């Protein structure tokens, strides 16, 4: 009876930008995969898109502890026979640091009719600039 169900024109979703420098990879991606699902707010319901847009800059200075820089590998396949391809997390920081965080977060998002729309509120940038100054973000001191 007396319960609340926030719907398509009962909520707003404001912007956050998070400096991703000087902190590890999977300790960061939990205070992002919970902002995208919207567990920082009351009037959280399932089955709708609450949450906040999250922007990540300084992807080039995330961390690893132990030999994950040489012994964490990213196997992918290609559906032809004999097609498995390997890539390590030491050459992925230097080559394409925009993908490395973007798969550290999308492994933590739900069943994938709405978890495809939640994941695309996330913008991952490599340097220190971003062309989303026209959307007015703010800094989010994540724990």
């Amino acid at each position: 009876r007396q319960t609340f169900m926030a719907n398509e024109s009962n909520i707003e979703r404001k912007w956050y930008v998070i400096d991703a420098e000087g902190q590890t990879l999977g300790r960061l991606s939990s205070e992002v995969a919970s902002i995208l699902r919207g567990k920082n707010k009351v009037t959280y319901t399932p089955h709708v898109d609450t949450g906040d847009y999250v922007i990540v800059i300084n992807a080039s200075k995330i961390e690893f502890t132990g030999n994950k820089e040489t012994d964490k590998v990213y196997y992918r396949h290609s559906n032809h026979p004999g097609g498995i391809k390997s890539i390590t997390a030491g050459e992925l920081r230097r080559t394409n640091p925009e993908r490395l965080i973007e798969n550290s977060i999308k492994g933590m998002l739900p069943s994938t009719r709405l978890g495809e729309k939640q994941g695309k509120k996330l913008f991952v940038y490599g340097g220190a600039e971003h062309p989303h100054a026209a959307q007015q973000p703010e800094n989010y001191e994540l724990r």
Binding site: K39, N40, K41, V42, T43, Y44, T45, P46
Partner: peptide, 11 residues
Amino acid sequence: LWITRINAAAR
């Protein structure tokens, strides 16, 4: 769900 909202109220 009710426990999820309270948890997102005390934090």
